[PDB]
Write a protein that binds this ligand. Structure first.
Ligand SMILES: C[C@H]1O[C@H](O[C@H]2[C@H](O)[C@@H](O)[C@@H](O[C@H]3[C@H](O)[C@@H](O)[C@@H](O)O[C@@H]3CO)O[C@@H]2CO)[C@H](O)[C@@H](O)[C@@H]1N[C@H]1C=C(CO)[C@@H](O)[C@H](O)[C@H]1O
Ligand SMILES: C[C@H]1O[C@H](O[C@H]2[C@H](O)[C@@H](O)[C@@H](O[C@H]3[C@H](O)[C@@H](O)[C@H](O)O[C@@H]3CO)O[C@@H]2CO)[C@H](O)[C@@H](O)[C@@H]1N[C@H]1C=C(CO)[C@@H](O)[C@H](O)[C@H]1O
Ligand SMILES: C[C@H]1O[C@H](O[C@H]2[C@H](O)[C@@H](O)[C@@H](O[C@H]3[C@H](O)[C@@H](O)[C@H](O)O[C@@H]3CO)O[C@@H]2CO)[C@H](O)[C@@H](O)[C@@H]1N[C@H]1C=C(CO)[C@@H](O)[C@H](O)[C@H]1O
Ligand SMILES: C[C@H]1O[C@H](O[C@H]2[C@H](O)[C@@H](O)[C@@H](O)O[C@@H]2CO)[C@H](O)[C@@H](O)[C@@H]1N[C@H]1C=C(CO)[C@@H](O)[C@H](O)[C@H]1O
Ligand SMILES: [Ca+2]
Ligand SMILES: [Ca+2]
Length: 650
């Protein structure tokens, strides 16, 4: 085994990685690693959170300086042939743990003489006098994930035990750089806060094995449908150009956005996801279309400018979208050139039958959630019973798959266009944006049509259909909690739960603090399902949990949502004058393969445990009473688990 002075013998934590943990005092010490008769020492400078190259031991061992007192993790990586190592620090009433084995009373859960596995370590104990003795493994944070040893593979998929991975496709993996600048889109050459970074469906497809190993069984992607081609001013200060990289500014529901890739790319993503038992969720919008942009105005011949003729080409250029702020201007300054009052010019856009907006001759937005122009976005007239025809500007968009359908309202078109993707690709469900800004009847129509569409795809593709499960729909209704609201009787199988974030925050430094929240949720969600999260694109990134974020999310009752990079502590990125933008930072793949490697392994083990046990997502909870540490049992049908947390090691 791998060993160094003062540290316990190293144990495997992910294939080819071995770790040891020990509370170290301030000071300096020599650092060598021994394996059999081999001696290795850091060849370069010894630093924290960095891949340290190593040499066969020679002369005096290098000095490892301990700047702060705390729990240190040493890691050795033997995958690249020659050993490299990683040093990291965890600094700083809560149950306390002396670091020694736990004797657990399992008499009420696991049968006398039966074998019980701690899934995290793989250690197996035989129940004797209703008790087992187990040492929580290095990296477990003092967790025992106790299951019947006969447990061997994932349980059947259930939405009420789902592990959803929410990915902003643009910010994940760039599979093909060729499509990064579709429709003449530009990088900003600054911090790329609001630009298309170039992540695409091909790139996402390449990481399906990565997601499968994490116990992900539902992949929620940012809308891949054709966005506004151009940009608007970013944040409150216009400090960056804001493009539709997040998929929430849709222009054509009938077409894929060229940045995301081809129909063949979507087909492969969905088919390869299904092969790995991963369901696909589209993020969808019916509330609004994207803002007017110079790109779209020029391309599709709509809107009015205060500029005319060649002074137009003087100020904005040959392509208006190529405009950049001059001295004393911001990225909002382009609005000064646009005549939003002009009725005739702006009717050429969506048209009066389609949207409410405070532009030209359009129906005025209302002063309520359903008919307001949210963040000045054109509000689609979902409640309208008027036969609309196509949006006016589609007359200048010959690549559209949209066709005029006799008797169709805007709502009929929207539900038809979204349902088309379900029918053609077998999309398993939707996450619905801006749920509280569209009338309930519109969401029911979408669900009914989407349900019929999936049933039709599964019938036509019996070789590809994983099961005969109905279409699934979740929604974001701002501030929704753990309640079976009227959304659940208008097409929604689960609503996104805003309240879990703050409860997890209160347990960030002591996992046991979550107990009441878990008891309440286990009890309430016997009758219905919610989708809970630590991190999202419109709140913040949960990074206060230290190394405990995995268990805080994945051991929650109900469906849970991993925001891409939760598993690798993806840092809050450049944000400018929009405080949400930093949540959409680039996926940190360099960290995944380096300083966050053991974090990914930790997330994989807890995620895989969840996938084996519907008792986690669906089970009634009994919180145990023990003299040492914290523990609960959950039970769903024949499935029964015990989670023990030893407590704080410091
Ligand atoms: C996505 C597409 O981007 C590029 O072409 C687009 C231009 O950037 C736009 O400005 C616009 O140009 C058209 C003018 O508006 C129009 O007045 C007329 O002059 O024709 C222009 C050229 O069509 O629209 C363009 C097309 O969207 C880029 O040059 C092009 O390669 C890109 N097309 C990809 C998309 C698909 C669809 O799956 C593939 O078939 C292509 O091979 C891709 O390259
Ligand atoms: C002030 C306003 O606050 C909350 O609004 C939420 C939206 O419900 C939520 O969808 C989200 O909006 C973003 C949207 O999701 C995204 O697609 C788009 O690109 O950007 C939007 C950013 O705004 O976030 C906002 C909060 O920032 C409440 O849900 C709203 O009810 C609330 N509205 C107020 C204001 C009025 C007008 O007088 C009343 O009609 C309304 O009853 C009141 O609640
Ligand atoms: C560890 C690795 O991290 C980053 O590479 C990422 C890419 O950023 C990301 O776009 C994606 O690209 C791969 C794609 O998934 C796949 O379909 C295609 O066939 O190959 C693409 C390129 O690998 O995923 C990778 C990996 O997550 C950085 O950009 C890389 O610099 C970085 N490379 C490592 C790799 C090794 C090999 O063990 C080290 O020895 C080396 O020092 C370091 O460069
Ligand atoms: C802004 C302007 O764009 C288009 O005009 C272009 C011509 O089509 C080209 O042949 C060449 O002359 O360059 C022109 C500018 O690029 C479009 O055809 C026009 O309709 C459009 N005018 C808008 C402006 C208005 C007022 O500001 C409205 O009166 C009018 O309806 C808008 O379409
Ligand atoms: Ca790309
Ligand atoms: Ca609305």
């Amino acid at each position: 085994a791998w060993t160094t002075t003062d540290f316990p013998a190293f144990t495997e934590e992910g294939t080819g990685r071995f770790i040891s943990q020990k509370v170290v005092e301030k000071g300096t010490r020599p650092l060598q690693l021994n394996f059999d008769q081999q001696c290795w020492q850091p060849s370069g400078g010894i630093k924290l959170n960095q891949m340290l190259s190593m040499e066969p031991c020679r002369g005096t061992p290098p000095q490892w300086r301990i700047f702060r007192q705390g729990l240190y993790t040493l890691e050795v990586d033997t995958r690249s042939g020659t050993p490299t190592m990683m040093i990291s620090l965890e600094e700083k009433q809560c149950p306390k743990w002396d670091g020694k084995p736990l004797t657990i009373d399992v008499s009420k859960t696991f049968a006398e003489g039966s074998k019980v596995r701690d899934f995290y370590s793989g250690n197996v104990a035989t129940v004797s006098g209703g008790k087992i003795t187990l040492q929580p493994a290095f990296g477990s944070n003092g967790l025992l994930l106790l299951e019947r040893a006969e447990t061997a593979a994932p349980a059947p998929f259930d939405w009420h035990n789902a592990t959803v991975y929410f990915v902003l496709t643009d910010r994940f993996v760039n599979g093909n750089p060729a499509n990064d600048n579709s429709y003449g889109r530009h990088k900003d050459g600054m911090q790329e806060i609001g630009t298309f970074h170039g992540g695409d469906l091909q790139g996402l497809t390449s990481k399906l094995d990565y997601l499968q190993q994490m116990g992900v069984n539902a992949l929620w992607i940012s809308s891949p449908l054709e966005q506004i081609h151009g940009w608007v001013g970013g944040g409150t200060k216009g400090d960056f150009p804001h493009y539709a990289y997040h998929g929430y500014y849709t222009q054509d529901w009938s077409k894929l956005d060229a940045n995301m890739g081809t129909e063949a790319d979507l087909r492969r993503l969905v088919d390869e996801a299904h092969k790995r038992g991963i369901r696909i969720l589209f993020d969808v919008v019916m509330n609004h279309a994207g803002y007017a942009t110079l790109a779209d105005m020029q391309e599709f011949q709509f809107g009015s400018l205060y500029l005319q003729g060649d002074e137009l080409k003087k100020t904005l250029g040959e392509r208006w979208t190529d405009w950049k702020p001059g001295a004393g201007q911001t990225w909002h300054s382009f609005n000064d050139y646009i005549n939003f009052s002009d009725k005739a010019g702006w009717e050429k856009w969506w048209g009066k039958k389609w949207i409410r907006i405070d532009i030209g001759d359009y129906d005025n937005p209302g002063y309520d959630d359903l008919t307001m122009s949210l963040a000045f976005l054109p509000d689609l007239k979902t409640e309208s019973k008027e036969i609309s025809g196509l949006p006016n500007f589609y007359s200048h968009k010959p690549d559209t798959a949209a066709k005029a359908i006799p008797g169709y309202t805007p709502r009929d078109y929207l539900t038809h266009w979204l349902s088309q993707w379900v029918r053609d690709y077998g999309i398993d469900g939707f996450r619905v944006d801006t749920a509280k800004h569209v009338e309930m009847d519109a969401w029911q129509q979408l669900k009914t049509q989407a349900t019929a569409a999936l049933a039709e795809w599964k019938k036509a593709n019996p070789d590809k259909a994983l099961d005969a499960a109905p279409f699934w729909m979740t929604g974001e209704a701002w501030g929704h909690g753990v309640m079976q609201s009227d959304y659940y009787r208008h097409g929604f199988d689960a609503m996104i739960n805003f309240d879990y974030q703050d409860q997890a925050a209160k347990a960030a430094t002591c996992m046991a603090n979550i107990d009441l929240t878990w008891q309440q949720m286990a009890d309430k969600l016997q009758s219905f399902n919610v989708l809970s999260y630590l991190s999202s694109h419109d709140t913040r990134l949960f990074r206060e949990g230290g190394a405990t974020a995995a268990e805080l999310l994945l051991l929650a009752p109900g469906a849970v949502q991993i925001f891409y990079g939760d598993e690798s502590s993806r840092p809050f990125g450049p944000t400018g004058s929009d405080p949400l933008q930093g949540t959409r930072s680039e996926m940190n793949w360099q960290d995944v393969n380096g300083k966050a490697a053991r974090s990914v392994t930790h997330w994989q083990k807890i995620g895989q445990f969840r996938a084996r046990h519907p008792a986690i997502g669906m089970g009634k909870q009994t919180t145990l009473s023990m003299s040492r540490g914290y523990g609960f049992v959950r039970e769903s049908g024949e499935d029964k688990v015990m989670v023990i947390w030893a407590g704080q090691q410091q």
